């Protein structure tokens, strides 16, 4: 009675048990792709607490650049520090509402890779973009707009050339808009790991948001809509939609095979599906 885990899975290895099989291969993937996204939003609450505990005169952001100067000296070391002990993030910032603030203000930490130092270098500039230019400012006008904390979906920042998803908190003092709080990680975390994912003979996973635009997708292009390759796969955006069927068999029909899908929601909203052909839940 020493069970191990199952090791590399020979090929060729009722349909109730695989049902029960499908349905927790999707709440365990889901868990793995959770991680380093519940990593993340961890460390980005316990900053922004910090961060708002701190800021106990904001009218003054609006007229001295003295105490913004102060305060972004007092926030760096904790934002370093929550930074570099955070598995998976690659950048982390604090930026300031540039309506009243000088627009390279703030916090801009960025490092390679997991295995390399967190470094502090100058941010980004809002004077030289437009606001609606996402790939250069939009971990600005994304959170802000939407007024709450933020899981923005995957976008290809490019002041550090990579493509990623980011999780950002608004700073707001009585309804008042002060700044953010981010940090991002390297969309491939995510894809790698999608990658990686098999059950049955043929089955894959894939991520697509609760309209059914696709996140990732080995077969479809991102951004495009399920139901744009495929009349079948309105069903299945059907599904997405209604919080009663998560974690719950769904059959449809794609490129001439009946199919069996199962999903949930992760921890930034996207959703996980995990599929196979019907024929491979057959006994
Ligand atoms: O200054 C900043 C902050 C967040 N993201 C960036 O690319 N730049």
Request: cysteine-free; proline content about 5%; hydrophobic content about 25%.
């Given at each position: 009675h020493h069970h191990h885990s199952s090791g590399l899975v020979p090929r060729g290895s009722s349909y109730e048990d695989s049902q029960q099989e499908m349905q927790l291969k999707c709440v365990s993937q889901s868990d793995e792709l959770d991680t380093m996204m519940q990593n993340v939003s961890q460390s980005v609450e316990m900053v922004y607490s910090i961060a708002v505990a701190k800021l106990?005169?904001?009218?003054?952001?609006?007229?001295?650049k003295d105490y913004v100067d102060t305060y972004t000296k007092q926030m760096l070391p904790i934002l370093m520090q929550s930074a570099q002990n955070?598995?998976?993030?690659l950048t982390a910032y604090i930026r300031y509402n540039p309506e009243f603030t000088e627009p390279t203000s703030g916090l801009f930490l960025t490092r390679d890779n997991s295995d390399s130092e967190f470094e502090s270098v100058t941010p980004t500039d809002?004077?030289?973009?437009?606001?609606?230019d996402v790939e250069h400012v939009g971990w600005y006008y994304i959170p802000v707009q939407n007024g709450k904390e933020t899981w923005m979906?995957?976008?290809?920042?490019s002041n550090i050339g990579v493509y990623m998803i980011s999780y950002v908190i608004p700073i707001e003092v009585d309804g008042e808009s002060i700044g953010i709080i981010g940090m991002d990680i390297d969309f491939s975390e995510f894809t790698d790991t999608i990658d990686s994912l098999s059950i049955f003979d043929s089955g894959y996973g894939f991520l697509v948001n609760?309209?059914?635009?696709?996140?990732?997708?080995?077969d479809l292009e991102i951004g495009?809509?399920?139901?744009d390759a495929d009349s079948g796969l309105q069903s299945v955006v059907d599904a997405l939609g209604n919080?009663?069927?998560?974690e719950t068999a769904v059959s449809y029909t794609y490129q001439g095979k009946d199919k069996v899908m199962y999903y949930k929601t992760l921890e930034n909203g996207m959703k996980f599906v995990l599929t196979a052909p019907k024929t491979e839940l057959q006994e």
């Open positions: 106990e005169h904001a009218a003054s952001f609006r007229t001295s955070t598995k998976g993030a809002f004077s030289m973009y437009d606001p609606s979906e995957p976008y290809l920042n609760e309209s059914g635009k696709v996140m990732y997708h080995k495009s809509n399920l139901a919080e009663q069927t998560e």
